Amino acid sequence: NLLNDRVLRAMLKAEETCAPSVSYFKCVQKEVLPSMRKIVATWMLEVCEEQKCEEEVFPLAMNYLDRFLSLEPVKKSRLQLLGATCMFVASKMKETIPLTAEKLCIYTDNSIRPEELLQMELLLVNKLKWNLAAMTPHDFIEHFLSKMPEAEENKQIIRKHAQTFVALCATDVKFISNPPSMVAAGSVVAAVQGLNLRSPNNFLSYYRLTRFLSRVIKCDPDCLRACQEQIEALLESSLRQAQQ
Template sequence: MELLLVNKLKWNLAATTPHDFIEHFLSKMPVAEENKQIIRKHAQTFVALCATDVKFISNPPSMVAAGSVVAAVQGLHLESAGGSLSYHCLAHFLSKVIKCDPDCLRACQEQIEALLESSLRQARQSLDPKAAEEEEEEEEQEEVDLSCTPTDVRDVSI
């Protein structure tokens, strides 16, 4: 998919971003135009969010775009009655379009959803500091309970 795009761009590699793929994917999807608009907005938001995290730098732009589109469709609950827009069908379809393993695409989509969840949690914590303290205490309690070594390595001073 990337080779096709760079050939169209006459090998101007600086121009290839995940945003370049979203419209192409939407044009191939059997979705009503009003649904395409909202999927486009959500996918663009996910792509912008991915640009802030170093985990996505190793993924090709087409994979980030496809993962963002799948995450948008799943998050918006736009699955059609015929099943042509179901999560699994869409992930499989887009993995064929970008020529990648469907499991890799699902993993990318799950990373995008995890990034969104952590970003929303951070935003919530910045708006409500008291709730943030309570969440941190819960996480610390869980960390203490998770130690399974005889000597907790966090207690060792080197």
């Protein structure tokens, strides 16, 4: 039941459906380069932040972007169009009132046109064979937090920091090959260390927490720790590049 956790079993099985390729920059994309994905990813994140989108819109949109770039080569000039379309669909999948085509085009400085976004929506959805209900890191974070015996005050902060970490991963090339379970696990344990603002005071110790998550998502402890270390490293990079 709760001891078997049949839901966690289904989630790990479902997250093998919508997985992009580790190496589509060499194999599929001619004009697009890994540096260009960080650019459009950064733009897409800023858009979801201004429009106060739901948490998962941006990481889900990045999921769609990678899967499409794993299937069809995309011109440099049409990469932004692809990303605006991914936000469009992701907004529909997780937001009550989704982003309008009119606003996304404005966010491309009126580079793309609404009818083009709508037609790119059909190309996107059909290339993904309508496989749009992808497991999100959010789905796993919520499941992990339901097993953590922590004050709701504490969970809300762990949740916010984890969600932040998830966004940063979705901009880094290194994390395309990570399934949402792994990105969520790393985000959680990195969040419970608390940005080093003070010492951790957790009713479930960090040791037991990592070994629990490692057993649950079926990886060796040293492997999840390296993921935590990548995310915190990615945090250091995010902050250094923000200040220029």
